[PDB]
Design a protein around this nucleic acid. Structure first.
Ligand SMILES: [Zn+2]
Lengths: 129, 134, 52, 149
RNA sequence: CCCACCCAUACCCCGCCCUCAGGGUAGAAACGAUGCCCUGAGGAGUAGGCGGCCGUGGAGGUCAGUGACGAAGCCUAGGGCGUGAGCCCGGGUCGAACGGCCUCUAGUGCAGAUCUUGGUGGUAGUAGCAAAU
RNA sequence: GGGACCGAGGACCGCGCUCUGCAAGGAUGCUGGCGUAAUGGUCACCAGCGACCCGUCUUGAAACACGGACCAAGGAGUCAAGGUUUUGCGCGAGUGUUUGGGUGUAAAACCCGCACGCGUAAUGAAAGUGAACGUAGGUGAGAGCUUCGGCGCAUCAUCGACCGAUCCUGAUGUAUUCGGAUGGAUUUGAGUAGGAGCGUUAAGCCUUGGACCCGAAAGAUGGUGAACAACCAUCUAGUAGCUGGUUACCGCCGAAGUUUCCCUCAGGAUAGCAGUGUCGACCUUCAGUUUUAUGAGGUAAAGCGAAUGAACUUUAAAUAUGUAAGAAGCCCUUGUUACUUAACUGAACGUGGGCAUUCGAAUGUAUCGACACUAGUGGGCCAUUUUUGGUAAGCAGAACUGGCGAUGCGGGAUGAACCGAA
RNA sequence: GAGACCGAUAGCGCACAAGUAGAGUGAUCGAAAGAUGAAAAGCACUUUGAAAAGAGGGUUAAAUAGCACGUGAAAUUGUUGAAAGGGAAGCGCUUGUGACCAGACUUGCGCCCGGCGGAUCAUCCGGUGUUCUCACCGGUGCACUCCGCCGGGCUCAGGCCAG
C-alpha cells in the first residue's frame, strides 16, 4: 500500500524495515509479513498458545514460530512445550508461560536480524470471525 | 532512539521549526549546517553531527557531536579552531569529519565557504560606508 | 529524452540499420533491370485488347 | 454508432480518430473490417508505407507503456524470444506476414496519425468507389499514408 | 467533373499543471523514505462518495515572536505570491494590543429565505396642503 | 534551397558514426542594446470578434410561476440518551479507577477495598441434559518454509466423530412400576470440533427529544372585558401535510433513471449501476465482435441438355438473429446406490490413459471472481429500421437501436431533435 | 468564590432613567439608548449676525479628539479633475491612446608586486577553563608560514532582450 493505518511509531518502524527487506530480497516471507503489517487489527486476529502448539506438534518442532499478531494465553493448555515465538505483542500470561517452558520470546526486529530471509520459520495466523 | 526522536520532531512539534508557505521548512537551531529542516541536517535527530560557526572575534570553529556526550547537554560540542588559510581549513574539515556522512562533510565545507565570503563582503561594505559617510 | 526521426538524421538511421551505409554506397535503390532483349507482345494479346 | 461496430472498433484498437493498425487478412478479419466500413479506410500498404510508419511513428508496449523504438535493444528485450532482435526484423515480420505476426502487431502501439496534408476528397463520407474516402482502396492507401504520416 | 484555398476545443509535434499506474532509492542519501529520482497514460460532469487545503472566536505548549521609535482596524487610478479559497509588502489614517507553528475546541465562512434589525436610494422637490408634525 | 514555431534536461555513464572528434540519451558560439527608464501595473476610453438575469420550482424539455430597490451586522443538520458499522489505541479470557473511599500544590492530578455490568459452553416448549474413538480425525486444495525429500497457516469442499432436542430399537435390572444402555434417522442448533472480548478515541448511519431553520386551522387551563360569543397569558419552539431557504476553494471517483416481490400510495425489500474492506487466481479469465459447426428464415438466386413440381430441388445466398469451440476436458473398462430401466440402460460416487517445450479458431484484454458493508436513482421526449391496426388525410400501439437527458466546441444567417466532433 | 461562556443587533427584556418610556377600558404588552481626553485644560478674547451657525485667536501630544465627541467601512450625496455618451449598460479575448504609479544584476572574486600591522607563525615563556586535548587570556618578536590593510597592474565572472 502507501501508508500504514496505525498511529504506532514503532509499527511504522517495522514497516520501514520490511519495506526495505521486501524490495531487496527474493524471499516472499518478507512480502507476506509486510502485507500483514499494513492490515488492520481485526484482520490480524489473536493467536493463542493452544493454536501454536498444534502447528508445532508435528515434525515442525525446532522452528521459529512467527505470528504477526498478538499472542494470547489459553487456560485449557495445561502443558506448554519449548518454543521460540516472534510476534508483535505478548500478553503477560503468554510471556510467562513460554519462559517457564524454557522457550524464548522474540520481536519482529529481532527476527529480521536472525532470519532475514525467513529461513526455518512457521508462519501462523488466528481464526477469522 | 535516533529515529524515534526524528518522528516526534518531524511530525508532532519542534521548537526550532519555521514553516513557510514557499514549499520549504526552516530550522532556527543555531547548530545546523543548513537552515532547512530535513533528516540530514536536524542536529537533534542526528546523534553524530558537525557544524561550522563564526565567533564575534572573527574566528571560525568546527563543532562535533558524538553519541557518547549525548546525555550531557553542556558537553555536546567539541570546538576546534579552523585555519585562516582557506585551503588548510577545508582540509581540516576533511581530517576531522573523517568517516562521517558525506552530507555533513559537504555542507560544512559550504558553511565554511559562505562564512569566509561574508567576512570579505563585510569588510568591503564597511570600507565603502566609511568613505561614503552616509 | 527526445524522439529522433531516422529518416531525417542519418546518425540514428545508422544506429538502427547499419546496412543503410552500404545501401547508399552500392546504390541498391538504383538497381537496373537485368539485360535481355524484350520480346514483343503477342499479336493474340492485341486483338483481345481491342476486341469491341 | 450501432453497438456492433463499436465493439469491432475496440477489438481493432481503433479507439481514436486517425488510429492505424496492421492486420493480416483472414476470413475472420475481413468480415470484421467490412462491418466498420462506414468509419474506416483501409488498403494494401507497400514497403515504404511500412518502413516510414515504424521509423517515424513506431512505438511499443513494454509493461503496458508506450515507449518509442529509438534503439534496437528494446526490440530484443520484448520480441527477441520470437527471433525479432532488430528494427529490420520488425519491418520484415509486418510486411511479409510471418509466423509471429500476432505478437509483433500487438507489440506495436496503434499509430497516431495526423490529418492528411492536402485534405481528403470533397465528399469524405462516401465510398471510395463512389468518389469518397471510406472503404477499401487497395494500393491507394499509400497516398493517404504519405499525406497523414 | 477537376485544381487550389479558409477554419473547431477535433487529429499530429512540443512545453507546463495535477491525478493514476509501473520502476529505482541504506553497512543511507548530498531533499522531512509522510522524502527524492525515472517512465507511460489520462483530464467534461448533475445526484452522490472520498481526500487535501484556506479563513474565524477561544484553549495548552512554542517562536527568549511583533509592539507608543506605533498593535489592531480601515482606506489606497501601487510592488509581489498562490489554479483557487486566500496571503505578504508599500503609501495614508490610527492609538494599545496582536500574530506564525503544532495540537484542542466551537454559538466557525452567506446573495437569496415576500429573511431579522439598522441605515440609505430612485420614485421626487413629484403627488398634494386629508391625517400627523 | 526558402520560411515559421520550439530549446524541455543539466558532471560522466547508453547506442553509434565518416573515430587526433561527431549533427551520436533535448542550444551553443559571436556581436550589440538596456537606468531623466528597459519593462510592468491600475484606471478611463476607443476599436475587432464574442457574449440572454441570477436563484428556486415544474416538466422530456423549454415557456410559465415564486424571490431579488441597495448596503452593513445577524442568520439555518446542533446537543443529549440508546443502538450499529469501520479506523486508531490500551489490556486481553478477561476487561471497565472516577457510586464511593484514600489523597491533594484542591472541582485538577495520583491510589483502590468490595460488589456490579459485558464476555469467557451450548441446546430444548419443557423435564432438564451436556462438548475427544482416531496428531480433535481422514482426504484434496491452499500462504509460507524446506535438509529439495517433504512439512503445511487461515479458509473451503467432502467423508467422518460427539453433544442438546425430536422420531425410533429397548441392557443388567427395578420399590413391580422406574430407568435409559446399545444399535438407527432424507432431522434440527443462533452447537463442540481449542476462545475474542471489554473500555476508549474519530467518522458515519438509525430511533426519540424543539431535532436543519421559518411558516396553519384547531384543542385545553386560568383570567379580562361585555356581544356580534371577543380579548389576554400559558400548555407551546403543539402537530399534519405543503412552500421558501439552507454559508470557502481545489483535486479524485462518479450514477441511475431499470427487472422482480409485497402490500396502505405517501413506500419499502431484492437484483443492476457508484464505492469501501477481506479472501482467492495470475494479470488468470472474459468480450453487445468475426470465423467454424449447427438451429430458426431454404429467405433471394442457378437449373429443370439433374429428378420432381415460397409450397421444385444438386447447390446456395445477403442480412440480422439462438446454441457450443477442453485440462474446471474426453471416452469407454470395472465395481455400488436411497433414484430409474428388461438390462453401468441412464444419474452420482470411486477407477485408467494420453497430451503440460502448437493444451486443440480469430481479435482485443487500463484485471477477474466470491463474500460483507454503504449513498443516490427508480421520469420521459424525438428519430431510423422492422411490424399490428386505421383514416379522405392526419393517426394510434409494440420491438430494437441511436440521440437529448449530467455535455462545452465548428457549421446549417437564427434554433431541444440536423451535419461534423467530444 | 470561579469559568476553553457572551462582549453592546451579542449576553437577562434591562452594562445607561428599565419593567423605565410608551400602548391598551383592562387582564396584559413592552422598547431604543455604552466609549472626549492622562487631565475639562469643555475654546478666554476680537469679529459677522438671531444660530444646535461662522471667521480669527487660544487649550492639548493630538481639536479632520469640541459633550454632533476613540477608531469611523459600505450603501447613498456634494465639489473638483479626466474620459465617454445617434433607441440600454455591465462582461470575455486582444491591442491601441491618455493619465497616474513602480523601478531591472545585491551589480564581484581571484592572481602579481611593494610597504605596513597582526596572528591560528616560534619545538618562546607565564596563566585560566576544560569534554583532558582541546580552547581562551597576558608578555615576547618577525627566521619561516598565514591573514588582513594601503598603492599599482592583470584576469575572468556575471541579470534581461535582440541580430
Ligand atoms: Zn529540525
Amino acid at each position: 500500500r502507501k501508508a500504514p493505518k496505525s498511529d504506532n511509531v514503532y509499527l511504522k518502524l517495522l514497516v520501514k524495515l520490511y519495506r526495505f527487506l521486501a524490495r531487496r530480497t527474493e524471499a516472499p516471507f518478507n512480502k507476506v509479513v509486510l502485507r500483514r503489517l499494513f492490515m488492520s487489527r481485526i484482520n490480524r486476529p489473536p493467536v493463542s498458545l493452544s493454536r501454536i502448539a498444534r502447528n508445532l506438534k508435528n515434525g515442525n518442532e525446532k522452528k521459529t514460530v512467527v505470528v504477526v499478531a498478538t499472542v494470547t494465553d489459553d487456560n485449557r493448555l495445561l502443558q506448554v512445550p519449548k518454543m521460540e515465538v516472534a510476534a508483535l505483542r505478548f500478553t503477560a500470561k503468554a510471556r510467562a508461560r513460554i519462559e517457564a517452558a524454557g522457550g524464548r520470546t522474540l520481536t519482529l526486529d529481532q527476527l529480521a536480524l536472525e532470519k532475514p530471509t525467513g529461513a526455518n520459520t512457521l508462519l501462523l495466523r488466528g481464526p477469522k470471525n | 532512539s535516533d529515529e524515534i526522536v526524528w518522528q516526534i520532531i518531524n511530525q508532532q512539534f519542534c521548537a526550532f521549526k519555521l514553516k513557510t508557505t514557499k514549499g520549504q521548512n526552516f530550522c532556527r537551531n543555531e547548530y545546523s549546517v543548513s537552515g532547512l529542516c530535513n533528516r540530514q541536517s536536524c542536529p537533534l535527530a542526528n546523534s553524530r553531527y558537525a557544524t561550522v560557526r563564526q565567533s564575534p572575534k572573527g574566528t571560525i570553529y568546527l563543532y562535533i557531536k558524538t553519541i557518547e556526550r549525548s546525555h550531557m547537554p553542556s558537553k555536546w560540542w567539541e570546538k576546534i579552531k579552523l585555519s585562516q588559510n582557506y585551503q588548510k581549513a577545508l582540509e581540516q574539515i576533511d581530517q576531522r569529519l573523517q568517516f562521517f556522512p558525506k552530507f555533513l562533510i559537504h555542507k560544512c565545507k559550504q558553511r565554511l565557504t559562505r562564512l569566509v565570503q561574508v567576512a570579505i563582503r563585510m569588510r568591503r561594505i564597511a570600507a565603502e560606508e566609511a568613505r561614503l559617510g552616509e | 529524452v527526445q524522439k529522433k526521426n531516422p529518416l531525417r538524421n542519418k546518425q540514428i538511421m545508422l544506429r538502427l540499420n547499419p546496412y543503410a551505409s552500404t545501401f547508399a554506397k552500392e546504390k541498391l535503390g538504383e538497381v537496373k533491370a537485368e539485360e535481355g532483349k524484350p520480346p514483343k507482345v503477342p499479336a493474340s494479346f492485341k486483338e483481345l485488347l481491342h476486341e469491341a | 454508432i450501432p453497438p456492433k461496430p463499436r465493439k469491432i472498433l475496440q477489438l481493432l484498437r481503433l479507439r481514436q480518430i486517425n488510429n492505424g493498425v496492421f492486420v493480416k487478412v483472414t476470413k475472420a478479419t475481413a468480415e470484421m473490417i467490412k462491418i466498420v466500413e462506414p468509419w474506416v479506410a483501409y488498403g494494401y500498404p507497400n514497403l515504404k508505407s511500412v518502413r516510414e510508419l515504424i521509423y517515424k511513428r513506431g512505438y511499443g508496449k513494454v509493461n503496458g507503456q508506450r515507449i518509442p523504438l529509438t534503439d534496437n535493444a528494446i526490440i530484443e528485450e520484448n520480441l527477441g524470444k520470437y527471433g525479432i532482435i532488430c528494427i529490420e526484423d520488425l519491418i520484415h515480420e509486418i510486411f511479409t506476414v510471418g509466423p509471429n505476426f500476432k505478437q509483433a502487431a500487438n507489440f506495436l502501439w496503434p499509430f497516431k496519425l495526423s490529418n492528411p496534408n492536402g485534405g481528403f476528397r470533397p465528399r469524405k463520407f462516401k465510398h471510395f468507389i463512389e468518389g469518397g474516402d471510406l472503404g477499401n482502396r487497395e494500393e491507394h492507401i499509400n497516398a493517404l499514408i504519405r499525406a497523414m504520416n
